[PDB]
C-alpha cells in the first residue's frame, strides 16, 4: 500500500533555542530530512516529515494543544523539577519514544544526572541521552522515529491519504470543519464506517495537522487547525490582563487583532468548553492559571477547581495560585484552597474533596498522597 512517512516532535522544556539551532519557533514548524543537520547523511529517512512543537513558562499549561517523539530538555538549575515533565509525558501524549537531553553543560562541566535510574523508571527512554552544550542527537532521533510504538511507516489505503490531503486543504482556510462536511469528505472516497473515520481522524490528530477532541460538544466546529486554534488559546491565556486574574467583558479584540469577532466568540466557546475558565457574570473571567500531596502536580487543577464560581466564594479572593471560599449551604463555613508549585502541594482551609477527586479522575495512574 502507501505509507504515511510523517511524525511530530514536541520539545518539552521547563534550551529550546539551542535545539532551534539544529533546525537552522513558537511551536508547529515543519522540516524534512535535508533540513535537519547531522541526519541528512542517512538516505533511509530521506522522505520523512518532521513536526517540531515547543513551549515554556510557569502558568502556560496546554496538555492537549503515540505518533510522536518527545525530546525532554534539562538544565542544571531546573533539575529539581524533573519528575514533572517526565510524568507529563508518561500520562498525556502517548506511548511515544522519549529522548532526554541535558543542555548548557559548559557552565557546569561536572554535572551528569543518573541516567540509568530514570531510564529504568521510564521505559520509553532506552538510553537515548545527550550531554552537549551550545551530534548524537541525530542518531537518537533516528533510532526513536522507527519504533513500533510510533507511527512513521504505517500502511494505509491511498484513498486515506487523498482524504487527508483534502482535509488539510479545507482546514488551512476554513480552520474548522462541520460534522456534515467531515462526513461528506469521508464519503467522497465512500468511507462511512465510524471506526474507519475515527481512525482517520485519530491519525490526522495524533500527527498534529488537524486537531479533533471528543469533548467539544459544539456543532459549529468538528475538527480544527492547530496553526490558529492553539495560538488563539495561547494569546488569551496570558495577555497581562489575565495576569491580574480577571479578563475584561469582551475585550478579546484588544488581545488579538485572520481573526475576527465571529472567531472571537468561537474561541470564547472553545475556552469554556476546554474547562479552563468560567464566565461568572457581567463579563467577568477567572483564568485560574487538608494536606494533599501530588507528584507531578497537574498545572491545571486549580483552573478546574475554580470553575465552581457560583459556589463557595467569599469575595473575588484569588491568588492566581489559590482562592477563598464561603459556604452558601446550611450553616456558615469559610474555606480557602491554595497551591504551591515549588512544593507540589495543595492546602485546604476550613464537597471540596469531591471536586478535587472529580478533577483528578481525568488521569491515568496518577499517584496521590494525603496527609
Amino acid at each position: 500500500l502507501v505509507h504515511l512517512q510523517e511524525i511530530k516532535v514536541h520539545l518539552i522544556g521547563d534550551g529550546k533555542t539551542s535545539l532551534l539551532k539544529q533546525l537552522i519557533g513558537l511551536n508547529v514548524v515543519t522540516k524534512q530530512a535535508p533540513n535537519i543537520k547531522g541526519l541528512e547523511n542517512d538516505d533511509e529517512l530521506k522522505e520523512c516529515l518532521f513536526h517540531f512543537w515547543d513551549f515554556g513558562g510557569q502558568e502556560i499549561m496546554h496538555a492537549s494543544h503515540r505518533s510522536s517523539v518527545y525530546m525532554l530538555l534539562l538544565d542544571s538549575r531546573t533539575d529539581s523539577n524533573k519528575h514533572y515533565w517526565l510524568r507529563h509525558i508518561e500520562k498525556y501524549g502517548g506511548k511515544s519514544p522519549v529522548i532526554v537531553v541535558m543542555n548548557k553543560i559548559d557552565e557546569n562541566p561536572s554535572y551528569n544526572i543518573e541516567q540509568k535510574k530514570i531510564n529504568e523508571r521510564f521505559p520509553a527512554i532506552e538510553n537515548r541521552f545527550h550531554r552537549i552544550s551550545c551530534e548524537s542527537i541525530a542518531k537518537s532521533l533516528k533510532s526513536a522515529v522507527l519504533h513500533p510504538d510510533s507511527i512513521y511507516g504505517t500502511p494505509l489505503a491511498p484513498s486515506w491519504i487523498k482524504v487527508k490531503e483534502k482535509l488539510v486543504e479545507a482546514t488551512t482556510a476554513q480552520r474548522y470543519l462541520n460534522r456534515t462536511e467531515v462526513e461528506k469528505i469521508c464519503n467522497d472516497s465512500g468511507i462511512t464506517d465510524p471506526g474507519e473515520r475515527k481512525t482517520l481522524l485519530g491519525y490526522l490528530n495524533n500527527l498534529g495537522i488537524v486537531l479533533y477532541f471528543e469533548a467539544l460538544d459544539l456543532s459549529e466546529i468538528y475538527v480544527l487547525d492547530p496553526h490558529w486554534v492553539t495560538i488563539g488559546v495561547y494569546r488569551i491565556i496570558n495577555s497581562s490582563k489575565t495576569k491580574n486574574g480577571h479578563l475584561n467583558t469582551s475585550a478579546l479584540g484588544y488581545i488579538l487583532n485572520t481573526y475576527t469577532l465571529l472567531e472571537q466568540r468561537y474561541l470564547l466557546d472553545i475556552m469554556k468548553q476546554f474547562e479552563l475558565c468560567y464566565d461568572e457574570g457581567k463579563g467577568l473571567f477567572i483564568i485560574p492559571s487538608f494536606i494533599m500531596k501530588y507528584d507531578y502536580l497537574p498545572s491545571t487543577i486549580i483552573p478546574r477547581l475554580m470553575i465552581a464560581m457560583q459556589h463557595q466564594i467569599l469575595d473575588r479572593m484569588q491568588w492566581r495560585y489559590g482562592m477563598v471560599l464561603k459556604s452558601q449551604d446550611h450553616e456558615g463555613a469559610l474555606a480557602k484552597v491554595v497551591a504551591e508549585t515549588k512544593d507540589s502541594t495543595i492546602t485546604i482551609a476550613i464537597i471540596i474533596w469531591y471536586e478535587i477527586k472529580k478533577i483528578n479522575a481525568n488521569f491515568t495512574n496518577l499517584d496521590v498522597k494525603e496527609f
Partner: nanobody
Amino acid sequence: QAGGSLRLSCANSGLTFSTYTMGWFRQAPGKEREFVAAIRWSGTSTYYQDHADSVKGRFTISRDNAKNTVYLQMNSLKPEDTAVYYCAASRLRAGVKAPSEYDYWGQ
C-alpha cells in the same frame, strides 16, 4: 567463536516486496519464535527498523535492493545466545509492526 562476527544473508525474489516486511527470528529450543530484528524496507526507504533485547550495535540489520536481500550482522556474539535464525514475511497492510502477521516463513 565467542564474540565474533557472522553475516547472514536472506534473499527473496519475485514476491509482494512492497506488501512484505522481513523479520529475523531466533529460536533453537522451541523458543516460540522470538522477534530479533525486522525491516519494512521499500527501496532506499525503511519504515519499521526496530530491534529487541540485544538491540543495536550488538546485532546489525540492513537491506540491499540491488539483489533484494536482507543482511543480519552478528557481532559480540554471546555464547549462551545460541539459536537458529529464520526469515519471516509479513503481508498485511492494516496496522504497522505486525508480529503475528509473519505467516510466510522463509527457508
